[PDB]
Design a protein around this ligand. Structure first.
Ligand SMILES: [Cl-]
Ligand SMILES: [Cl-]
Ligand SMILES: [Cl-]
Ligand SMILES: [Cl-]
Ligand SMILES: [Cl-]
Ligand SMILES: [Cl-]
Ligand SMILES: [Cl-]
Ligand SMILES: [Cl-]
Ligand SMILES: [Cl-]
Ligand SMILES: [Cl-]
Ligand SMILES: [Cl-]
Ligand SMILES: [Cl-]
Ligand SMILES: [Cl-]
Ligand SMILES: [Cl-]
Ligand SMILES: [Cl-]
Ligand code: NA
Ligand code: NA
Ligand code: NA
Ligand code: NA
Ligand code: NA
Ligand code: NA
Ligand code: NA
Lengths: 243, 243, 243
């Protein structure tokens, strides 16, 4: 019966917490047939760039190639209740040349250590822009952004939701205030009616205009001021004063 | 040739649909060497909290530790066309103490049963806020929100997209209407020109103001009304009436 | 010692780049005990619909059922540095009937080949709407949309962020301009003050109105124009002209 020389050699227990940036795991074999074995990571799945953040005492499957010193460790997924901080990166390469820092792959990263969840893309295959969808749990924010300045923003400590583009035009909802900003113009359109604000003008073009102030009304011009009516012009007040 | 006592014992077939909240699976061994075996879940991958939603008749790999009664079941991924409703939770623990309801982990959940896709974070390691990015397929919505009231919203039955913060400031795009609301002020800025609306004021500060009405123009003040011009003030109408 | 007839038969090397839409992989066994073997995909994990985009020379585990011609290939995850373009689809079925094009499942897809990252849902189990959260790296955009016209948009080449609903109401932030559009009305609310624009009206209802123009002020009506003040009406200018 032909069987590969590469086989499950012994069930084991991790003797140490795997260091975050390490692929080696010290494992103690616990089957009756120093005492630790330095094992190389054997992934449970493809497209996972980081080994599991194995804690001391987790059940580990130790694989061995024949009688050689090539030992491998595979997480068995039976000791999840031991996990503390976990950071996992799933990578999907996006370059014609192989080899590879996330510069040549699309990825999704859950990092408790660095306190973010991020989906990011790369510019290694003709893509014009890079993107990131990030939940930043450290500062407290959700971002949707490219690499040229366009950004959706939810920032919790400032109670801010914002639509911001690369030209500093934005719609900002921060606390009890809303701020719109645009260097060329801001225009409201409803049917045939328009209201525009631009660096030199405030323009309204509509059918009927009604400006009601329960208190005072003030309109002041540094230059000339014109009132024009195709129909009758009406003034109603207890008295009229011309300075 | 040393080999672990823990080995693939027999290929089998699931005899029942696995109940959603169960880790045990009844499996019938189908290799010639009651008839069902209660098996414990053996995961194919780490960071998966839920066993596959195995349907009756799926090919199952039955593992066994030596001659003991410890039987384990592993989905082989060769019977995907039998799947009906699936709910899968990937968890990434985010607490210094181990052990663990999603209160101590970042996670991503695809649930056909509960009709949502959700990416959520936890507040178990000093994070100031929790977050959720949810596609709610039951009610019909996409949400981006924290746990204090800041929210992006796409709600389909109401044709609503909204930016809403914890102070009830919002930019609402619902059906054929747009509503902006902010308790302190709403300000539009374009260059040196500003338009502000606040609880007691409507203020415009610009260079040139043009208000054209194809129909009627009405401005009414409960108190005083002042017209001021540094240059000539012009009135043009077929007739003028002072009440 | 009972062991399944289905076992790891030999470690091997992929002889060819797996074609994107293929489940078969030509593998050369490299254990001493034509020369290629057509193997069927054996997944490393459940809920993965696409086999890994295996490149020539990757280490492959060849499984075999007994002495039969049923050979299977499993990616070992030890040759990731050979990956070039990768497209991976994780599927989560969402239909009461089994069987299945993404029409009956929720899914998440990372595709370097087609240049997008997409989370999508289906309408096979009573869901009223389908959804997609897509990073389109080809055109350069992030979309959040349903299947009836509601859409959040980040489009990089146009420097556009937009909230757009099925009735063509939108808040558009494009380059140096902001455009709001709504067929019924656009209303700003701050406390008791309101500013509304609708197809026939421009309405302001506030306490105090101040319209300051450093240059000229023009208000023109095709019909009548009325000025009403409950208090004194004041005119201040170097001279007044009635046409
Ligand atoms: Cl290492
Ligand atoms: Cl793994
Ligand atoms: Cl080697
Ligand atoms: Cl990379
Ligand atoms: Cl501001
Ligand atoms: Cl159970
Ligand atoms: Cl599994
Ligand atoms: Cl046990
Ligand atoms: Cl938890
Ligand atoms: Cl409202
Ligand atoms: Cl095929
Ligand atoms: Cl796989
Ligand atoms: Cl078969
Ligand atoms: Cl499908
Ligand atoms: Cl427009
Ligand atoms: Na890690
Ligand atoms: Na301000
Ligand atoms: Na696996
Ligand atoms: Na489930
Ligand atoms: Na309303
Ligand atoms: Na592929
Ligand atoms: Na325009």
């Amino acid at each position: 019966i032909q069987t590969s020389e590469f086989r499950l050699w012994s069930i084991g227990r991790a003797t140490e917490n795997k260091p975050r940036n390490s692929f080696t795991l010290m494992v103690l074999p616990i089957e009756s047939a120093s005492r630790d074995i330095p094992c190389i990571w054997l992934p449970n799945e493809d497209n996972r760039a980081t080994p599991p953040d194995v804690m001391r005492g987790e059940k580990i499957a130790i694989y061995r190639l024949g009688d050689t010193s090539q030992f491998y460790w595979r997480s068995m997924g039976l000791s999840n209740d031991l996990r503390t901080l976990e950071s996992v990166v799933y990578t999907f390469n996006a370059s014609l040349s192989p080899g590879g820092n996330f510069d040549t792959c699309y990825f999704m990263q859950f990092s408790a250590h660095d306190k973010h969840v991020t989906i990011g893309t790369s510019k290694a295959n003709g893509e014009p822009y890079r993107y990131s969808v990030q939940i930043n749990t450290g500062t407290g924010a959700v971002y949707i952004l490219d690499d040229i300045g366009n950004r959706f923003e939810l920032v919790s400590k400032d109670k801010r939701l914002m639509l911001m583009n690369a030209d500093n035009s934005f719609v900002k909802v921060e606390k009890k205030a809303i701020d719109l900003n645009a260097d060329q113009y801001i225009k409201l359109t409803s049917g045939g009616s328009t209201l525009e604000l631009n660096p030199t003008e405030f323009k309204v073009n509509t059918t009927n205009t009604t400006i009601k102030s329960s208190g005072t009304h003030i309109q002041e011009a540094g230059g000339t001021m014109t009132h024009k009516a195709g129909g009758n012009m009406l003034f109603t007040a207890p008295r009229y004063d011309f300075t």
